[PDB]
Write a protein that binds this ligand. Structure first.
Ligand SMILES: OC[C@H]1O[C@H](O[C@H]2O[C@H](CO)[C@@H](O)[C@H](O)[C@H]2O)[C@H](O)[C@@H](O)[C@@H]1O
Ligand SMILES: OC[C@H]1O[C@H](O[C@H]2O[C@H](CO)[C@@H](O)[C@H](O)[C@H]2O)[C@H](O)[C@@H](O)[C@@H]1O
Length: 284
């Protein structure tokens, strides 16, 4: 049902960021595996975009999977930032890798008996690369990573400056505050194409989606959505080639001849990957 589901609106203290992170939550039951649904570049501070734009909770109720939707961190790339995250609205502390990989799972285990290990992270847009970086560096916790419509080589060429533009347009943040000048090693570290050997060695299950910029009847037929999806598509194709070349063998690659940078297409993927998540994480 949409109303009447056991959906919580948690307030999870983050020592590292000095505030309470709101977290929308639906348990799949005691000791259930978690699915972290990471929001896109323009993440709002009231509700995660996955809740706003999809019936995700509804789709995953009684799936044996806990659904975890952190709220906030627009333009954060769910990263630990070098300096305060200062945008149009003011400064906030961004230490999202710390939060997602310790404070949150520990709180969820202690307070809701959510299994802290063997989780998936699924992100769209900005959070698509973040999902893979979470699995790259925290494979115990994240054994599955979904990346929807993300720029997958952000440290390369125009990469850093395109990221700067977007953060600027979304809340007016500056990429220097996050991973520093493009010279800083933080860029390579958070580039999922660069971290492909990790993904392979950890045998991380991947779900990699990117549309082609052509809208079908689902909608999203507008130029920005079309131009954005097409623009990030090649990094998705190059990721695929590199991953296979590095001996990758645990990914689903989803590059249909349709799809724009719009929630209609992302929802469709989240819905599509439920049974795969259940098998890969042992929901049964
Ligand atoms: O980066 C994730 C955001 O994707 C959407 O916004 C992008 O694409 C829109 C077209 O669908 C553009 O209008 C917008 O300027 C882009 O940033 C989505 O609207 C947001 O909810 C996501 O956070
Ligand atoms: O940095 C983003 C991507 O840039 C290159 O490719 C882009 O540039 C052209 C458009 O201006 C097209 O080749 C394509 O649509 C874009 O993705 C680079 O080749 C990619 O690896 C980068 O992800």
């Amino acid at each position: 049902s949409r109303p009447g589901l056991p959906v919580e609106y948690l307030q999870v203290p983050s020592p590292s960021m000095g505030r309470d992170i709101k977290v929308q939550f639906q348990s799949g039951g005691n000791n259930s595996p978690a699915v972290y649904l990471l929001d896109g570049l323009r993440a709002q501070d009231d509700y995660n975009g996955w809740d706003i734009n999809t019936p995700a909770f509804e789709w995953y109720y009684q799936s044996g999977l806990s659904i975890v939707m952190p709220v906030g961190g627009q333009s954060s790339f769910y990263s630990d930032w070098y300096s305060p995250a200062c945008g149009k609205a003011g400064c906030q502390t961004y230490k999202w890798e710390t939060f997602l990989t310790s404070e949150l799972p520990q709180w969820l285990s202690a307070n809701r008996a959510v299994k802290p290990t063997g989780s998936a992270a699924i992100g769209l847009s900005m959070a698509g690369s973040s999902a893979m970086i979470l699995a790259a560096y925290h494979p115990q916790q994240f054994i599955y990573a979904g990346s929807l419509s993300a720029l997958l080589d952000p440290s390369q060429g125009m990469g850093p400056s395109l990221i700067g533009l977007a953060m600027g347009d979304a809340g007016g943040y500056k990429a220097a505050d996050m991973w520093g000048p493009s010279s800083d090693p933080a860029w390579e570290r958070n580039d999922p194409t660069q971290q492909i050997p990790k993904l392979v060695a950890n045998n991380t299950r991947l779900w990699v989606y990117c549309g082609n910029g052509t809208p079908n009847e689902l909608g999203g037929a507008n130029i920005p959505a079309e131009f954005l999806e097409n623009f990030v598509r090649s990094s998705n194709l190059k990721f695929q080639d590199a991953y296979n070349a590095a001996g990758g063998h645990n990914a689903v690659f989803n590059f249909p001849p349709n799809g724009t940078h719009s929630w209609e297409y992302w929802g469709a993927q989240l819905n599509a990957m439920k049974g795969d998540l259940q098998s890969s994480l042992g929901a049964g």
